[model samples]
Target: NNMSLQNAEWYWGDISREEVNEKLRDTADGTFLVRDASTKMHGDYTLTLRKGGNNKLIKIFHRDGKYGFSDPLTFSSVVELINHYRNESLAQYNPKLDVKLLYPVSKYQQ
Candidate 1:
């Protein structure tokens, strides 16, 4: 399902970890990282998608400072990036990602 990310609304309730991983596996990417929701509580998950080989790094940052860089995950489509985040990375946390305020914003709006 190549749905539009622009029209997509990600509430805490609608998407599941299993659903996310299923979708990401369907797409193509270089590498991708899913931040643990527990860790996400401390900061924001920043995903920067570039067209070519330039700007391929995704930096994880806290409110206070930059955490580090992740070169493990990358993708071409926004769906691929997001799918990777929700399913693979965040699924391992305890209590699971049950309910929270989740919203979507993009650098380049379609």
Candidate 2:
């Protein structure tokens, strides 16, 4: 059952990095959430994660009306970006940070 990204609760618009850490600090590996990049540019975001009992952050760059990290392939929106990564490993983008989007910290719950 693949829910449309638009209806996903993991996208926390305009949230702070401090807030992202607070929510993910105690979560398991692969737990993540999307928030506006803190102390930075507009349209960009931080893909916060908790892996191996540690909180990790990946910057999602949004430019030229596209979204992605260091990958050459990009998406028209953050929605498409997240959908792609859910089934793919981030190791393609970064060798160390290899984790699929298994768990999402819902704004409603956290």
Candidate 3:
């Protein structure tokens, strides 16, 4: 898990939602980054992004050795989910926040 996320520039591990919100601040809608999930119900990671002028958080659930935002579209790995969602709309999982990721805020770039 560490290997995959470490390779992903957008994976800003162990950061708080407050910190991440600031990180995405002033970025365009659909700007996003993955951070360590801090809730018991949530999986290991949380996908936080700028939508409109606010931030929306999506839980990345790991089940049966796979990962997904929602049950309908699980993937072999979180990176696969990230790659696919870049071009695919997130409408099915979250109709209200229907948006494809446009920018992934890299930790290195900061």
Best-fitting candidate, measured by TM-score?
3
Native-referenced Cα lDDT, model 2:
0.75
Backbone clashes counted, model 2: 0
lDDT of 3 by residue, 1-110 (tens): 55886889999888787899778888888899998799748887899878888888898988777888877546888888888889888886778878888899987875
- TM, every model: 0.25, 0.82, 0.90
Which candidate's lDDT is highest?
3
In model 2, what is the error at residue 62, expressed in angstroms? 1.4
Q: Per-candidate RMSD vs. true structure?
A: 14.1, 3.6, 1.5
Report residue 64 deviation for candidate 2 (angstroms): 1.7
Pairs with steric clashes in candidate 1? 31-73, 31-74, 32-73, 32-74
- Which residue pairs overlap in candidate 2's backbone? none
Over the stretch 1-110, how does candidate 2's per-residue lDDT look in tens digits? 11444466898878777777778877778898887776566336788877788877888776676778855536877778887778898787777878888788886865
The better candidate by TM-score, 1 or 2, is: 2
Model 1 per-residue lDDT tens digits across residues 43-107: 34433222122212243433322232233323444445465554544323222332211223222
> Which residue segments of model 1 deviate by more than 4 Å?
1-16, 30-36, 41-43, 46-59, 65-110
